[PDB]
Design a protein around this motif. Structure first.
Motif, PDB file in Angstrom:
ATOM      1  N   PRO A  34     -24.645 -15.385 -23.894  1.00 23.01           N
ATOM      2  CA  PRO A  34     -25.179 -14.285 -23.081  1.00 23.01           C
ATOM      3  C   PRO A  34     -26.531 -13.817 -23.594  1.00 23.01           C
ATOM      4  CG  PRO A  34     -22.893 -13.881 -23.749  1.00 23.01           C
ATOM      5  CD  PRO A  34     -23.401 -15.011 -24.584  1.00 23.01           C
ATOM      6  N   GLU A  35     -27.456 -13.606 -22.661  1.00 25.38           N
ATOM      7  CA  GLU A  35     -28.775 -13.105 -23.018  1.00 25.38           C
ATOM      8  C   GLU A  35     -28.693 -11.636 -23.413  1.00 25.38           C
ATOM      9  OE1 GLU A  35     -31.471 -13.888 -19.798  1.00 25.38           O
ATOM     10  OE2 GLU A  35     -32.014 -15.856 -20.604  1.00 25.38           O
ATOM     11  N   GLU A  36     -29.489 -11.253 -24.406  1.00 24.38           N
ATOM     12  CA  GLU A  36     -29.491  -9.895 -24.925  1.00 24.38           C
ATOM     13  C   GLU A  36     -30.824  -9.216 -24.637  1.00 24.38           C
ATOM     14  OE1 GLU A  36     -26.839  -8.808 -25.489  1.00 24.38           O
ATOM     15  OE2 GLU A  36     -26.925  -6.985 -26.700  1.00 24.38           O
ATOM     16  N   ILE A  37     -30.782  -7.884 -24.609  1.00 20.09           N
ATOM     17  CA  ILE A  37     -31.950  -7.066 -24.307  1.00 20.09           C
ATOM     18  C   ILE A  37     -32.208  -6.122 -25.475  1.00 20.09           C
ATOM     19  CG2 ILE A  37     -30.712  -5.206 -23.125  1.00 20.09           C
ATOM     20  CD1 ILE A  37     -33.011  -5.120 -21.109  1.00 20.09           C
ATOM     21  N   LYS A  96     -36.317  -9.242 -24.583  1.00 19.94           N
ATOM     22  CA  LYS A  96     -35.252 -10.077 -24.040  1.00 19.94           C
ATOM     23  C   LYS A  96     -34.910 -11.151 -25.067  1.00 19.94           C
ATOM     24  CE  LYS A  96     -36.074 -12.280 -20.176  1.00 19.94           C
ATOM     25  NZ  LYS A  96     -36.064 -12.676 -18.741  1.00 19.94           N
ATOM     26  N   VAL A  97     -33.709 -11.065 -25.625  1.00 16.56           N
ATOM     27  CA  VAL A  97     -33.224 -12.007 -26.626  1.00 16.56           C
ATOM     28  C   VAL A  97     -32.277 -12.969 -25.923  1.00 16.56           C
ATOM     29  CG1 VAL A  97     -32.236 -12.240 -28.923  1.00 16.56           C
ATOM     30  CG2 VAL A  97     -33.420 -10.147 -28.279  1.00 16.56           C
ATOM     31  N   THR A  98     -32.698 -14.224 -25.787  1.00 17.39           N
ATOM     32  CA  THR A  98     -31.935 -15.215 -25.038  1.00 17.39           C
ATOM     33  C   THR A  98     -31.419 -16.292 -25.980  1.00 17.39           C
ATOM     34  OG1 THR A  98     -33.826 -16.642 -24.543  1.00 17.39           O
ATOM     35  CG2 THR A  98     -33.449 -14.757 -23.098  1.00 17.39           C
ATOM     36  N   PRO A  99     -30.119 -16.344 -26.260  1.00 17.07           N
ATOM     37  CA  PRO A  99     -29.600 -17.399 -27.138  1.00 17.07           C
ATOM     38  C   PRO A  99     -29.717 -18.765 -26.482  1.00 17.07           C
ATOM     39  CG  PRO A  99     -28.066 -15.548 -26.967  1.00 17.07           C
ATOM     40  CD  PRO A  99     -29.070 -15.389 -25.870  1.00 17.07           C
ATOM     41  N   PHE A 138     -42.902  -3.554 -12.943  1.00 18.35           N
ATOM     42  CA  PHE A 138     -42.418  -4.888 -13.263  1.00 18.35           C
ATOM     43  C   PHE A 138     -40.903  -4.883 -13.433  1.00 18.35           C
ATOM     44  CE2 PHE A 138     -46.815  -4.815 -14.744  1.00 18.35           C
ATOM     45  CZ  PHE A 138     -47.314  -5.951 -14.142  1.00 18.35           C
ATOM     46  N   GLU A 139     -40.292  -6.034 -13.169  1.00 24.45           N
ATOM     47  CA  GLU A 139     -38.846  -6.193 -13.223  1.00 24.45           C
ATOM     48  C   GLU A 139     -38.477  -7.237 -14.266  1.00 24.45           C
ATOM     49  OE1 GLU A 139     -35.538  -7.208  -9.846  1.00 24.45           O
ATOM     50  OE2 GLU A 139     -36.341  -5.182 -10.100  1.00 24.45           O
ATOM     51  N   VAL A 140     -37.411  -6.963 -15.014  1.00 28.14           N
ATOM     52  CA  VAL A 140     -36.901  -7.878 -16.025  1.00 28.14           C
ATOM     53  C   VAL A 140     -35.407  -8.061 -15.807  1.00 28.14           C
ATOM     54  CG1 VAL A 140     -36.327  -6.158 -17.769  1.00 28.14           C
ATOM     55  CG2 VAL A 140     -36.930  -8.483 -18.468  1.00 28.14           C
ATOM     56  N   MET A 141     -34.915  -9.249 -16.146  1.00 28.67           N
ATOM     57  CA  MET A 141     -33.511  -9.589 -15.994  1.00 28.67           C
ATOM     58  C   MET A 141     -32.905  -9.925 -17.349  1.00 28.67           C
ATOM     59  SD  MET A 141     -32.943  -9.218 -12.770  1.00 28.67           S
ATOM     60  CE  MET A 141     -33.710  -9.290 -11.152  1.00 28.67           C
ATOM     61  N   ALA A 142     -31.579  -9.857 -17.413  1.00 31.28           N
ATOM     62  CA  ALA A 142     -30.807 -10.211 -18.599  1.00 31.28           C
ATOM     63  C   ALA A 142     -29.618 -11.078 -18.208  1.00 31.28           C
ATOM     64  CB  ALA A 142     -30.347  -8.965 -19.350  1.00 31.28           C
ATOM     65  N   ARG A 143     -29.880 -12.096 -17.390  1.00 33.08           N
ATOM     66  CA  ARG A 143     -28.815 -12.960 -16.897  1.00 33.08           C
ATOM     67  C   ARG A 143     -28.169 -13.726 -18.044  1.00 33.08           C
ATOM     68  N   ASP A 144     -26.843 -13.823 -18.001  1.00 31.52           N
ATOM     69  CA  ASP A 144     -26.085 -14.531 -19.029  1.00 31.52           C
ATOM     70  C   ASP A 144     -26.285 -16.028 -18.847  1.00 31.52           C
ATOM     71  OD1 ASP A 144     -25.214 -11.888 -19.320  1.00 31.52           O
ATOM     72  OD2 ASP A 144     -23.397 -12.274 -18.149  1.00 31.52           O
ATOM     73  N   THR A 145     -27.173 -16.611 -19.649  1.00 30.69           N
ATOM     74  CA  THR A 145     -27.425 -18.039 -19.564  1.00 30.69           C
ATOM     75  C   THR A 145     -26.229 -18.824 -20.102  1.00 30.69           C
ATOM     76  OG1 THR A 145     -29.026 -19.780 -20.076  1.00 30.69           O
ATOM     77  CG2 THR A 145     -28.493 -18.214 -21.824  1.00 30.69           C
ATOM     78  N   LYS A 146     -26.239 -20.133 -19.837  1.00 26.06           N
ATOM     79  CA  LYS A 146     -25.125 -20.979 -20.252  1.00 26.06           C
ATOM     80  C   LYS A 146     -25.014 -21.069 -21.769  1.00 26.06           C
ATOM     81  CE  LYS A 146     -25.503 -25.221 -20.633  1.00 26.06           C
ATOM     82  NZ  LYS A 146     -25.747 -26.246 -21.685  1.00 26.06           N
ATOM     83  N   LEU A 147     -26.132 -20.946 -22.482  1.00 21.89           N
ATOM     84  CA  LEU A 147     -26.133 -21.033 -23.943  1.00 21.89           C
ATOM     85  C   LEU A 147     -26.010 -19.639 -24.563  1.00 21.89           C
ATOM     86  CD1 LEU A 147     -28.688 -22.835 -22.574  1.00 21.89           C
ATOM     87  CD2 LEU A 147     -28.307 -24.067 -24.720  1.00 21.89           C
TER      88      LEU A 147
END
Lengths: 100, 306, 52, 52, 208, 58, 220
Positions: free
Chosen positions: E122-125, E161-164, E111-120
């Motif tokens: 940066p997403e954290e891992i 995956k911690v996404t603000p 499986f694959e996971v991403m940590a793309r920096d969302t607009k709200l």
């Protein structure tokens, strides 16, 4: 009926209904349905459906007496599964019991 | 209808084979005609189905963390070793998981017999190879052989509670590889020729005996004759502000101490006058307990803790 | 998944690992599967004879 | 298309200690009884197709 | 020369050039996920100290033994209807073909996971998202990914995956519950990757 | 007290009032409303009242 | 070592759904090891129908050796039906030996088992199984040859009919195995001839199997 046996149950019923004049226990009259299996487990009667026994056909109105039919043991295992009701009984199992 | 038919031959001859007590086929000449295939089949099936044995159910290799990697200096991969460690007949004669350690090197064809096993778990198949080395590093394989029955899957004992690195090997506990069956008729009684080819875990003369004992035990059952009220904290009910303080200052933390004394304990400390002397008892009775009706300081330890 | 005790026993005591349906051959004419199974049985008996 | 014919498989079965009929006696496992018919018990090459 | 599974060293040749190629080592491919999410493993069929001519298969590939292609394993078959369990084209099965580990594959999912920096933000891992039990956080290192070789049940936390994001819709009952328990509303939304329902279990490799 | 606590957040009425706004509806708008709110909040924190909610906040 | 105690055992086997009479009993076993259900059911079915302690008749009135005609004129059915209904005549003989059982029925009315005459330490349990009524009919003269044998034995002087009656107490027996969770639930339904209770017929079968399973060594 669409619930008719397609491949395996039809083959089993055909193997149970195939009657041959040559087999162990020729014309050995049996008492009840369980007598057939009790003798088959003892190796005295085979499953080639060539032995006589008792079975209730239930053809006329009301209950029918347990007439000693000249039928076979293999067709009796399927005949016992048939419900008790006029117009049905061992007369249907007398054929080869194919899929049709 | 018991002990009347032709009994089996007393002390039947166990014709030993050429497998070193692994293919001794049992023979029973005098036996009932219709009973020959019954006893033989019920023994071969029940015996095969049940036979407390032992096999490596949790492999712990130091040069690997999962059962899918490959060891450093070993030809067969980690998953291939599980395919060989699985068919590792070992008898222990003891309850509880063991700690069979394996650490060998040198030529490379490490045999099952070269395992640092305890003095109770007799590993069988001494000429059985588990893997192959390349004249390099060794492997400190640590086994966890248990005693089970038949065959248990891998996801039943390994992922329950084990550290990261314990192989989830589904060891087969059946101590018989292939059981044979023959009924030769000998007034015409048939002879039962059982040729169970059990491994070195149990001898064939003993495997049939164990199966017969299991069947007899299974049939013996067929024959007729042939209230956390005081377990709570002293301040876990919140009766009032003058009750929790008294319960904490009276050297008590559970509810049994407060339920044993109704009013005698209210005259030994302060803030326990006649204003609050029966409300606490009524609240305790409503919960399910009463003024005593138990042993003094009975559940005072962690035995009945919950 | 039938246990290794309920499977049909062979003459040598070995239990078959799979029990297919013979009705598939007459319906779909793949009788070579039966010939392939006979050849595989011959090879297995030869292997048991050589390893024995 | 140039494999073993019926005669080749027959000779292989005769030389491999296999019954000439191609089938073999197969005792039942559930109840346990010698089947009153020659049963084909061979080594078929089964697969583990990805459609699990 | 030697065989250790991960690789296989071979001498130059019986008649080799002076400095043409020297010895040729074949790095055996270990259990990597194929294009079909299946295992691709190779075993060094050659033994230590066995001369091999050029042009032959040294180590078998996925589903191969002794160089010959082997799609599966040969199992003793009885072409008889056993109690109707193979009434249709279904195939009855013995426990020996599952107990001996003969028809078992790997099927590495990867499986694959991403940590793309969302607009709200940066997403954290990081280790884990709040409001998660400690039982699911097991088998995770400080980075937040599952430890290599640690079995993961279906649905367990694979990579935290911690996404603000922004303030969620303040509901009255949830606000009352938060004030009762004293906790504060987590500004981050749970987005940690989890294993789908399956029997995957162990983890082979965790590439970052 | 239950009415003022519900008015503090809003179970039926979605108009979430502040401390003073819910205070005027009951008594003099002062710290008494905040005091009773704190008392109620600390009230349903025991294992008896807050039993089915211990596994609700996650 | 104890490999017969570390497995599931149905401590409560007294589960008899069918309780119409003392001839049919649906013995049930809720917990049981995977596969033990079918093996125990087979060992009980092929043992109850195997050699046991029962009784037969194997006899007929004089001059009725052939089934083409009745004994004298035919009361209500053919002699074949009479011998078939007499073959299932439940009777438990105590003393060993081929005792005789005479039957005389004079007067219009179906002769029942209670009218049999056989003072040879044998008692008929099913009194209403045969009907041979006849208007002023007294030509039965049917004596029996009940012998305590072992399981169903086929037909091995002049006039003596070769009746293949079974020397077994159980007549119809069938088992079933369905998991109750992988553990099988042995729910075999045994039906005896009448001179044995089915709750104890399976017990007798299990005891016989255990006594004949004395092929163990090094046991206490």
């Amino acid at each position: 009926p669409i619930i008719v046996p397609s491949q395996d149950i039809v083959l089993g019923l055909y193997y149970l209904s195939v009657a041959r004049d040559g087999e162990p226990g020729e014309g050995k009259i049996f008492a009840d349905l369980g007598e057939i299996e009790a003798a088959m487990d003892a190796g005295v009667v085979s499953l080639h459906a060539k032995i006589k026994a008792r079975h209730t056909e239930m053809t006329p109105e009301g209950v029918l007496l347990r007439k000693v039919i000249d039928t076979t043991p293999g067709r009796m295992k399927i005949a016992a599964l048939l419900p008790h009701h006029p117009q049905i009984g061992h007369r249907l199992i007398e054929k080869a019991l194919t899929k049709k | 209808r018991n002990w009347n038919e032709l009994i089996r031959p007393e002390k039947p001859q166990i014709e030993t084979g050429a497998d070193a007590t692994r293919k001794a086929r049992i023979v029973a000449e005098p036996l009932e005609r219709g009973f020959g295939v019954t006893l033989g089949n019920a023994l071969r099936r029940v015996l095969l189905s049940s036979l407390q044995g032992a096999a490596v159910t949790a492999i712990q290799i130091d040069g690997v963390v999962h059962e899918f990697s490959s060891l450093e200096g070993v030809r067969e991969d980690v998953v291939d070793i599980v395919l060989n460690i699985k068919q590792l007949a070992v008898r222990m004669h003891a309850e509880g998981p063991k700690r069979m350690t394996l650490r060998a090197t040198g030529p490379g064809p490490v045999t099952a017999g070269q395992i640092e096993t305890p003095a109770d778990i007799e590993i069988l198949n001494p000429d059985h190879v588990l893997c192959t080395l390349d004249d390099g590093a060794s492997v400190r394989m640590e086994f966890t052989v248990n005693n089970g029955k038949g065959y248990v899957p891998a996801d039943r004992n390994r992922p329950e509670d084990a550290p990261i690195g314990l192989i989830a090997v589904d060891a087969l506990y059946s101590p018989v590889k292939r059981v044979a069956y023959r009924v030769e008729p000998t007034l015409d009684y048939d002879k039962l020729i059982l040729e169970v080819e059990t491994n070195g875990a149990v001898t064939p003369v003993d495997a049939v005996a164990y199966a017969a004992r299991i069947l007899q035990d299974q049939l013996q059952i067929f024959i007729t004759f042939e209230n956390p009220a005081l377990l709570k904290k002293v301040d876990e009910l919140e009766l009032s502000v003058r009750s929790a303080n008294c319960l904490k200052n009276d050297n008590i933390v559970y509810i049994g101490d407060l339920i044993q004394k109704t009013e005698a304990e209210m005259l030994r400390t302060p803030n326990f006058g006649r204003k609050s002397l029966n409300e606490i008892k009524e609240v305790l009775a409503g919960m399910g307990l009463h003024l005593g009706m138990d042993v003094p300081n009975w559940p005072p330890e962690n035995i009945e803790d919950l | 998944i039938l246990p290794i005790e309920d499977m049909p026993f062979l003459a040598d005591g070995t239990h078959v690992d799979v029990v297919l349906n013979p009705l598939g051959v007459p319906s779909r004419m793949n009788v070579g599967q039966i010939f392939e199974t006979h050849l595989g049985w011959a090879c297995a008996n030869l292997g048991k004879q050589i390893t024995n | 298309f140039d494999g073993a014919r019926m005669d080749d498989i027959e000779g292989h079965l005769e030389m491999a200690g296999v019954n000439k009929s191609g089938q073999s006696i197969l005792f039942d496992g559930l109840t346990g009884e010698q089947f009153k018919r020659p049963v084909t018990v061979g080594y078929i090459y089964m697969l583990k197709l990805h459609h699990l | 020369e030697q065989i250790d599974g991960t690789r296989i060293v071979i001498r130059a040749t019986e008649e080799t050039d002076p400095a043409r190629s020297g010895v040729d080592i074949y790095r055996m491919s270990k259990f990597q996920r194929s294009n079909q999410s299946t295992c691709i493993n190779q075993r060094p069929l050659v033994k230590v100290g066995d001369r091999i001519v050029a042009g032959d298969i040294i180590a078998d590939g996925p589903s191969t033994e002794l160089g010959e292609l082997a799609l599966g394993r040969n199992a003793l078959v009885a072409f008889m209807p056993w109690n109707g369990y193979n009434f249709e084209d279904s195939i009855l099965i013995s426990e020996r073909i599952v107990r001996d580990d003969v028809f078992t594959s790997i099927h590495i999912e990867e499986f694959e996971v991403m940590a793309r920096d969302t607009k709200l933000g940066p997403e954290e891992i990081t280790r884990d998202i709040p409001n998660v039990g400690e039982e699911a956080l097991r088998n995770l290192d400080e980075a937040g990914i599952v430890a290599i070789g640690a079995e993961v049940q279906p649905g367990d936390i694979l990579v935290g995956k911690v996404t603000p994001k922004g303030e969620s819709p303040m509901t009255p009952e949830e606000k009352l519950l938060r004030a009762i328990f004293g906790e504060k509303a987590s500004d981050v939304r749970d987005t940690s990757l989890r294993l789908p329902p399956g029997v995957a279990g162990t983890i082979v490799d965790v590439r970052v | 007290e239950e009415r003022v606590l519900r008015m503090r957040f809003g179970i039926g009425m979605n108009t979430d009032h502040t401390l003073e706004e819910v205070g005027q509806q009951f008594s003099v708008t002062r710290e008494r409303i905040r005091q009773i709110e704190a008392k109620a909040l600390r009230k349903l924190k025991h294992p008896s009242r807050s039993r089915k909610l211990r596994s609700f906040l996650d």
